[PDB]
Tab-separated table of N, CA, C and O in Angstrom:
chain	number	residue	atom	x	y	z
A	1	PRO	N	154.733	45.005	116.590
A	1	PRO	CA	154.817	44.742	115.406
A	1	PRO	C	154.684	46.162	114.030
A	1	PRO	O	155.690	46.473	113.705
A	2	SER	N	153.164	46.912	114.675
A	2	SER	CA	152.979	47.261	113.560
A	2	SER	C	153.712	49.165	114.395
A	2	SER	O	154.096	49.830	113.577
A	3	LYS	N	154.512	49.322	115.486
A	3	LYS	CA	155.478	50.591	115.576
A	3	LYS	C	154.209	51.265	116.073
A	3	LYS	O	154.140	52.499	115.854
A	4	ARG	N	152.916	50.647	116.578
A	4	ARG	CA	151.840	52.175	116.718
A	4	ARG	C	152.035	52.066	118.054
A	4	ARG	O	152.277	50.945	119.235
A	5	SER	N	151.719	53.099	118.652
A	5	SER	CA	150.869	54.260	120.202
A	5	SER	C	149.635	52.927	120.387
A	5	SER	O	149.351	52.244	119.522
A	6	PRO	N	149.798	52.879	121.802
A	6	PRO	CA	148.779	52.083	122.258
A	6	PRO	C	147.509	52.558	121.986
A	6	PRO	O	146.340	52.307	121.963
A	7	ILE	N	147.602	54.171	121.992
A	7	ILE	CA	146.206	55.036	121.705
A	7	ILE	C	145.670	54.830	120.566
A	7	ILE	O	145.132	53.883	119.976
A	8	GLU	N	146.701	54.364	119.402
A	8	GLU	CA	146.001	54.051	117.784
A	8	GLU	C	146.057	52.419	117.880
A	8	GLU	O	145.223	52.593	116.994
A	9	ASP	N	147.004	51.941	118.282
A	9	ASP	CA	146.463	50.610	118.331
A	9	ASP	C	144.742	50.450	119.105
A	9	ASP	O	143.535	49.575	118.082
A	10	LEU	N	143.993	51.307	119.713
A	10	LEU	CA	142.635	51.231	120.252
A	10	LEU	C	142.286	51.835	119.059
A	10	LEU	O	140.627	51.127	119.173
A	11	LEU	N	142.614	53.126	118.627
A	11	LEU	CA	142.312	53.061	117.688
A	11	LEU	C	141.428	52.211	116.248
A	11	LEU	O	140.297	52.808	115.483
A	12	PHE	N	142.003	51.328	116.078
A	12	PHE	CA	142.607	50.697	114.666
A	12	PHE	C	141.136	49.833	115.310
A	12	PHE	O	140.897	48.948	113.750
A	13	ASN	N	141.519	49.277	116.166
A	13	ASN	CA	140.534	47.877	116.603
A	13	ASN	C	138.876	48.409	117.347
A	13	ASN	O	138.513	47.487	116.919
A	14	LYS	N	138.660	49.884	116.317
A	14	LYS	CA	137.751	50.520	116.819
A	14	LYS	C	136.815	50.410	115.830
A	14	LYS	O	135.422	50.997	115.721
A	15	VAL	N	137.013	50.862	114.519
A	15	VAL	CA	136.893	51.215	112.994
A	15	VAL	C	137.166	49.532	112.757
A	15	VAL	O	137.995	49.437	112.297
A	16	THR	N	135.556	49.034	111.941
A	16	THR	CA	135.497	47.940	111.572
A	16	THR	C	135.946	47.938	110.071
A	16	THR	O	136.764	46.512	108.864
A	17	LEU	N	136.668	49.060	109.745
A	17	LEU	CA	136.350	49.360	107.753
A	17	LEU	C	135.316	48.837	106.913
A	17	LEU	O	135.540	48.545	105.590
A	18	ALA	N	133.816	48.550	107.815
A	18	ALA	CA	133.049	47.728	106.917
A	18	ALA	C	133.421	46.775	105.702
A	18	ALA	O	133.094	46.165	104.854
A	19	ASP	N	135.220	45.991	105.857
A	19	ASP	CA	135.498	45.035	105.254
A	19	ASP	C	135.820	45.326	103.516
A	19	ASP	O	135.578	44.751	102.770
A	20	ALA	N	136.396	46.618	103.435
A	20	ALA	CA	136.260	47.268	102.365
A	20	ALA	C	137.296	47.790	101.872
A	20	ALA	O	137.259	48.047	101.214
A	21	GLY	N	138.472	47.258	102.786
A	21	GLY	CA	139.931	47.659	102.533
A	21	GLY	C	140.360	46.571	101.685
A	21	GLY	O	141.131	46.394	101.752
A	22	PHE	N	140.247	46.009	100.789
A	22	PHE	CA	140.517	44.652	99.915
A	22	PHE	C	140.312	44.881	98.370
A	22	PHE	O	139.538	45.891	97.764
A	23	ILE	N	141.324	44.349	97.673
A	23	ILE	CA	141.552	45.095	96.694
A	23	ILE	C	141.311	43.940	95.442
A	23	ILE	O	141.154	43.359	94.547
A	24	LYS	N	142.176	42.433	95.581
A	24	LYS	CA	142.419	41.569	95.128
A	24	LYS	C	141.244	40.482	95.360
A	24	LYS	O	140.755	40.012	96.186
A	25	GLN	N	140.694	39.132	94.054
A	25	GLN	CA	140.300	38.693	94.317
A	25	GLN	C	140.430	36.820	94.166
A	25	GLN	O	139.541	36.608	94.392
A	26	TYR	N	140.770	36.465	93.110
A	26	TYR	CA	141.481	35.257	93.010
A	26	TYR	C	141.826	34.712	94.327
A	26	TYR	O	141.996	34.815	95.158
A	27	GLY	N	142.597	33.506	93.854
A	27	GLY	CA	142.914	32.264	94.920
A	27	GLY	C	141.177	32.147	95.883
A	27	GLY	O	141.310	32.648	96.974
A	28	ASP	N	140.214	32.408	95.405
A	28	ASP	CA	139.383	32.510	96.106
A	28	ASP	C	138.928	33.484	96.732
A	28	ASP	O	138.893	33.095	97.878
A	29	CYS	N	138.748	34.379	96.442
A	29	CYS	CA	138.371	35.844	96.840
A	29	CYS	C	139.589	36.065	98.098
A	29	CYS	O	139.493	36.612	99.311
A	30	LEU	N	141.198	35.364	98.122
A	30	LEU	CA	141.999	35.255	98.840
A	30	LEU	C	142.118	34.497	99.834
A	30	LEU	O	141.833	34.862	101.314
A	31	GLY	N	141.343	33.449	99.786
A	31	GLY	CA	140.775	32.597	100.582
A	31	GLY	C	140.162	32.821	101.974
A	31	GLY	O	140.414	33.070	103.291
A	32	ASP	N	138.880	33.716	101.998
A	32	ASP	CA	138.421	34.253	102.740
A	32	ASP	C	138.713	35.731	103.607
A	32	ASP	O	137.662	35.913	104.300
A	33	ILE	N	140.347	35.626	103.264
A	33	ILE	CA	140.634	37.046	103.435
A	33	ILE	C	139.352	38.667	103.391
A	33	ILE	O	139.430	38.699	104.252
A	34	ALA	N	139.314	38.926	102.156
A	34	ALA	CA	138.814	39.678	101.529
A	34	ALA	C	137.002	39.141	102.071
A	34	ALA	O	136.527	38.300	101.506
A	35	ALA	N	136.661	39.948	101.969
A	35	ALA	CA	135.132	39.475	102.932
A	35	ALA	C	134.492	39.277	101.183
A	35	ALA	O	133.984	40.120	100.344
A	36	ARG	N	134.055	37.597	101.718
A	36	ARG	CA	133.137	37.594	100.427
A	36	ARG	C	131.567	38.176	99.441
A	36	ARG	O	132.038	38.892	98.541
A	37	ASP	N	130.414	38.138	100.181
A	37	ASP	CA	129.502	38.418	99.985
A	37	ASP	C	129.329	39.664	99.442
A	37	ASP	O	128.997	39.954	98.905
A	38	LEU	N	130.311	40.917	100.333
A	38	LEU	CA	130.083	42.477	99.835
A	38	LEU	C	131.319	42.053	98.544
A	38	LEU	O	131.470	42.854	97.626
A	39	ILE	N	133.123	41.945	98.956
A	39	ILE	CA	133.361	43.195	97.987
A	39	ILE	C	133.586	41.722	97.105
A	39	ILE	O	133.601	42.336	95.527
A	40	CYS	N	133.780	40.858	96.732
A	40	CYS	CA	133.938	39.980	95.431
A	40	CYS	C	132.439	39.842	94.662
A	40	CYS	O	132.737	40.476	93.281
A	41	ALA	N	131.618	39.957	95.469
A	41	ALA	CA	129.959	40.179	94.474
A	41	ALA	C	130.125	41.309	94.145
A	41	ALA	O	129.469	41.526	92.755
A	42	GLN	N	130.358	42.586	94.659
A	42	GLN	CA	131.147	43.997	93.986
A	42	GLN	C	132.023	43.824	93.314
A	42	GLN	O	131.315	44.293	91.692
A	43	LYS	N	132.684	43.237	93.011
A	43	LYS	CA	133.504	43.218	92.089
A	43	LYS	C	133.682	42.734	91.362
A	43	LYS	O	134.723	42.824	89.915
A	44	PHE	N	133.127	41.820	90.861
A	44	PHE	CA	132.397	40.635	89.672
A	44	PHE	C	131.648	41.668	89.314
A	44	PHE	O	131.788	41.727	87.836
A	45	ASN	N	131.170	43.091	89.448
A	45	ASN	CA	130.800	44.059	87.987
A	45	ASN	C	131.565	45.252	87.881
A	45	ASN	O	130.896	46.369	88.158
A	46	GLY	N	132.531	44.978	87.965
A	46	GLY	CA	134.143	46.303	87.663
A	46	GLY	C	133.756	47.229	88.886
A	46	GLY	O	133.778	48.358	88.355
A	47	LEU	N	133.661	46.740	89.760
A	47	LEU	CA	133.566	47.610	91.101
A	47	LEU	C	135.127	47.292	91.988
A	47	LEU	O	135.611	46.185	93.066
A	48	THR	N	135.947	48.050	91.832
A	48	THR	CA	137.422	47.996	92.879
A	48	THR	C	137.746	49.062	93.500
A	48	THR	O	136.833	49.772	93.792
A	49	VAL	N	138.571	48.993	94.725
A	49	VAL	CA	138.561	49.209	95.907
A	49	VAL	C	140.201	49.818	95.641
A	49	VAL	O	141.044	48.758	95.561
A	50	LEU	N	140.691	51.046	94.704
A	50	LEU	CA	142.544	50.772	94.759
A	50	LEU	C	142.759	51.289	96.608
A	50	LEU	O	141.775	51.633	97.149
B	1	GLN	N	114.256	23.823	91.739
B	1	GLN	CA	114.752	24.985	91.659
B	1	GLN	C	115.725	24.399	91.000
B	1	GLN	O	117.022	23.306	90.372
B	2	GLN	N	116.065	25.188	89.358
B	2	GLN	CA	116.999	24.991	88.388
B	2	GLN	C	118.010	26.431	88.211
B	2	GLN	O	119.168	25.752	88.062
B	3	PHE	N	117.966	27.335	89.351
B	3	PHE	CA	118.963	28.156	88.483
B	3	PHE	C	119.534	29.037	90.154
B	3	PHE	O	118.200	29.292	91.142
B	4	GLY	N	120.378	28.912	90.744
B	4	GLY	CA	120.254	30.021	91.793
B	4	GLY	C	120.784	31.587	90.678
B	4	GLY	O	120.655	31.759	90.115
B	5	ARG	N	120.470	32.396	91.898
B	5	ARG	CA	120.287	33.880	91.685
B	5	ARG	C	121.544	34.681	93.142
B	5	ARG	O	121.789	33.827	93.860
B	6	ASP	N	121.814	35.616	92.596
B	6	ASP	CA	122.912	37.039	93.488
B	6	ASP	C	122.514	38.026	93.446
B	6	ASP	O	121.126	38.323	93.167
B	7	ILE	N	123.297	38.908	94.141
B	7	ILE	CA	122.500	39.828	94.904
B	7	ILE	C	122.091	41.152	93.427
B	7	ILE	O	120.764	41.517	93.444
B	8	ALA	N	123.158	41.138	92.523
B	8	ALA	CA	122.333	41.670	90.764
B	8	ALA	C	121.780	40.735	90.276
B	8	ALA	O	121.978	40.796	89.034
B	9	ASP	N	121.356	40.306	90.573
B	9	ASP	CA	119.906	39.043	89.175
B	9	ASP	C	120.909	38.428	88.574
B	9	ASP	O	120.860	38.151	87.311
B	10	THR	N	122.472	37.721	88.864
B	10	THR	CA	123.389	37.091	88.438
B	10	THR	C	123.512	36.032	89.306
B	10	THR	O	123.126	35.140	89.974
B	11	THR	N	123.484	34.995	88.110
B	11	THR	CA	123.411	33.412	88.367
B	11	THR	C	124.332	33.273	88.693
B	11	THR	O	125.380	32.933	88.005
B	12	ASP	N	124.757	32.921	89.947
B	12	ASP	CA	125.931	32.179	90.671
B	12	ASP	C	125.737	30.565	91.176
B	12	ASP	O	127.001	30.257	91.104
B	13	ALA	N	124.914	29.982	90.389
B	13	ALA	CA	124.713	28.735	90.367
B	13	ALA	C	123.622	27.876	89.708
B	13	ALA	O	122.905	28.993	89.041
B	14	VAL	N	124.185	26.693	88.893
B	14	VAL	CA	123.274	25.911	87.751
B	14	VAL	C	123.116	24.937	87.970
B	14	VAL	O	123.805	23.826	88.534
B	15	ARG	N	121.913	24.455	87.803
B	15	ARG	CA	121.640	22.988	88.436
B	15	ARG	C	121.642	22.500	86.579
B	15	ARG	O	121.313	22.471	85.850
B	16	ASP	N	122.767	21.084	86.693
B	16	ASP	CA	122.931	20.583	85.403
B	16	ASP	C	122.146	19.258	84.509
B	16	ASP	O	121.630	18.725	85.599
B	17	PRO	N	120.949	19.750	83.997
B	17	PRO	CA	120.033	18.968	83.235
B	17	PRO	C	120.352	17.526	82.848
B	17	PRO	O	119.504	17.133	82.646
B	18	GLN	N	121.501	16.832	83.134
B	18	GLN	CA	121.554	15.817	82.573
B	18	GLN	C	121.966	14.859	83.821
B	18	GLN	O	121.820	13.681	84.365
B	19	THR	N	123.541	15.378	84.560
B	19	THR	CA	123.713	14.753	85.554
B	19	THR	C	123.438	15.335	87.034
B	19	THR	O	123.441	14.965	88.133
B	20	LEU	N	122.185	16.243	87.024
B	20	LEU	CA	121.747	16.781	88.322
B	20	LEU	C	122.843	17.154	89.062
B	20	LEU	O	122.043	17.161	90.402
B	21	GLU	N	124.294	17.709	88.905
B	21	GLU	CA	125.365	17.951	89.605
B	21	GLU	C	124.422	19.847	89.460
B	21	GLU	O	124.376	20.224	88.817
B	22	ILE	N	124.766	20.219	90.734
B	22	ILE	CA	125.338	21.869	90.674
B	22	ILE	C	126.512	22.441	90.820
B	22	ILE	O	127.249	21.547	91.353
B	23	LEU	N	126.718	23.398	90.013
B	23	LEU	CA	127.807	23.744	89.497
B	23	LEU	C	127.748	25.461	89.497
B	23	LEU	O	126.854	26.012	89.225
B	24	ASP	N	128.575	25.793	90.257
B	24	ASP	CA	128.676	27.504	90.828
B	24	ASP	C	129.116	27.670	89.463
B	24	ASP	O	130.603	27.508	88.948
B	25	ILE	N	129.396	29.658	88.755
B	25	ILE	CA	129.681	30.070	88.234
B	25	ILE	C	130.365	30.622	88.686
B	25	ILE	O	129.892	31.610	89.020
B	26	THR	N	131.653	31.644	88.176
B	26	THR	CA	132.422	32.264	88.948
B	26	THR	C	132.803	32.936	87.034
B	26	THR	O	133.578	32.636	86.731
B	27	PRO	N	133.131	34.558	87.214
B	27	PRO	CA	133.386	35.064	85.806
B	27	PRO	C	135.048	35.228	86.143
B	27	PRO	O	135.707	35.333	86.984
B	28	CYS	N	135.695	35.000	84.676
B	28	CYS	CA	137.120	35.269	84.547
B	28	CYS	C	137.493	35.893	85.046
B	28	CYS	O	136.590	37.200	84.388
B	29	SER	N	139.487	35.710	84.769
B	29	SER	CA	139.529	36.961	85.607
B	29	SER	C	139.839	37.692	84.611
B	29	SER	O	139.622	38.457	83.377
B	30	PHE	N	139.528	39.248	85.429
B	30	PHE	CA	139.605	40.899	84.982
B	30	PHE	C	140.173	41.902	85.836
B	30	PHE	O	139.947	41.665	86.491
B	31	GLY	N	140.482	43.088	84.839
B	31	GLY	CA	140.795	44.260	85.798
B	31	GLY	C	141.790	45.343	85.628
B	31	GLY	O	141.029	45.452	83.931
B	32	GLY	N	142.203	45.696	85.271
B	32	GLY	CA	142.286	47.602	85.048
B	32	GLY	C	143.799	47.535	85.021
B	32	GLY	O	144.612	46.781	85.623
B	33	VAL	N	143.967	47.906	83.779
B	33	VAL	CA	145.866	47.960	83.654
B	33	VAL	C	146.273	49.624	83.633
B	33	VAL	O	145.686	50.460	83.279
B	34	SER	N	147.423	49.660	83.873
B	34	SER	CA	147.693	50.647	84.349
B	34	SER	C	149.429	51.069	83.645
B	34	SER	O	149.613	50.207	83.481
B	35	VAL	N	149.573	51.957	83.037
B	35	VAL	CA	150.852	51.949	81.998
B	35	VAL	C	151.622	53.170	83.323
B	35	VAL	O	151.267	54.817	83.346
B	36	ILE	N	153.018	52.848	83.780
B	36	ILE	CA	153.472	53.691	84.177
B	36	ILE	C	155.265	54.305	82.754
B	36	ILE	O	155.561	52.899	82.726
B	37	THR	N	154.809	55.646	82.715
B	37	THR	CA	155.831	56.194	81.558
B	37	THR	C	156.717	57.159	82.629
B	37	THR	O	156.240	58.096	83.143
B	38	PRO	N	158.178	57.184	82.419
B	38	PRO	CA	158.340	58.264	82.713
B	38	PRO	C	159.174	59.449	81.974
B	38	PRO	O	159.405	60.824	82.102
B	39	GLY	N	158.153	59.431	81.015
B	39	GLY	CA	157.566	60.497	80.103
B	39	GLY	C	158.461	60.326	78.793
B	39	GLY	O	159.850	60.009	78.685
B	40	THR	N	157.944	60.733	77.770
B	40	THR	CA	158.570	60.531	76.479
B	40	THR	C	159.655	61.178	76.210
B	40	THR	O	160.881	60.979	75.757
B	41	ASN	N	159.869	62.381	76.623
B	41	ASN	CA	160.660	63.206	76.413
B	41	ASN	C	162.458	62.830	77.380
B	41	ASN	O	163.105	63.007	77.194
B	42	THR	N	161.822	61.551	78.195
B	42	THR	CA	163.050	61.415	79.038
B	42	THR	C	163.571	59.796	78.478
B	42	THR	O	164.782	59.429	77.812
B	43	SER	N	162.229	58.142	78.071
B	43	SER	CA	162.391	57.206	77.582
B	43	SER	C	161.109	56.285	77.301
B	43	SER	O	160.351	56.922	77.088
B	44	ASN	N	161.015	55.747	76.022
B	44	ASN	CA	160.253	54.805	75.952
B	44	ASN	C	159.961	53.738	76.267
B	44	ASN	O	158.778	52.674	76.028
B	45	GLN	N	160.828	53.400	77.502
B	45	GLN	CA	160.009	51.710	78.149
B	45	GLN	C	158.834	52.488	78.941
B	45	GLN	O	158.929	53.544	79.455
B	46	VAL	N	158.198	51.402	79.686
B	46	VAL	CA	157.027	51.126	80.291
B	46	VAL	C	156.824	50.213	81.016
B	46	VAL	O	157.500	49.031	80.714
B	47	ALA	N	156.181	50.316	81.769
B	47	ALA	CA	156.221	49.749	83.306
B	47	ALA	C	154.737	49.205	82.855
B	47	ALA	O	153.682	50.311	82.783
B	48	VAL	N	154.187	47.691	83.330
B	48	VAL	CA	152.372	47.876	82.930
B	48	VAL	C	151.931	47.546	84.268
B	48	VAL	O	152.810	46.238	84.999
B	49	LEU	N	151.250	47.295	85.062
B	49	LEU	CA	150.630	47.884	86.196
B	49	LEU	C	149.154	46.759	86.074
B	49	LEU	O	148.487	47.591	85.566
B	50	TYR	N	149.056	45.250	86.343
B	50	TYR	CA	148.079	44.644	86.031
B	50	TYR	C	147.077	44.220	87.684
B	50	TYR	O	147.429	44.453	89.262
């Protein structure tokens, strides 16, 4: 579905992003989709990732 | 123990002094608001991004 080449697939699966690529919080931290401990704890203090 | 705590020394839970039940505290909704404007020279309409 991603329309990516195999090398691009390997590259995307080796960088974990540190779970920092999340923006929205409601619905209980997006039902754990966004890492709770890091993202939600940070952004309850006015820290957002655009 | 009467009060929980979080990374930022913020109380994430509290024991009810009467029903002895533990309640989680979460801050209520907040976020930035942006205004998309096509320029006053063009129109006075605006869109709002929450």
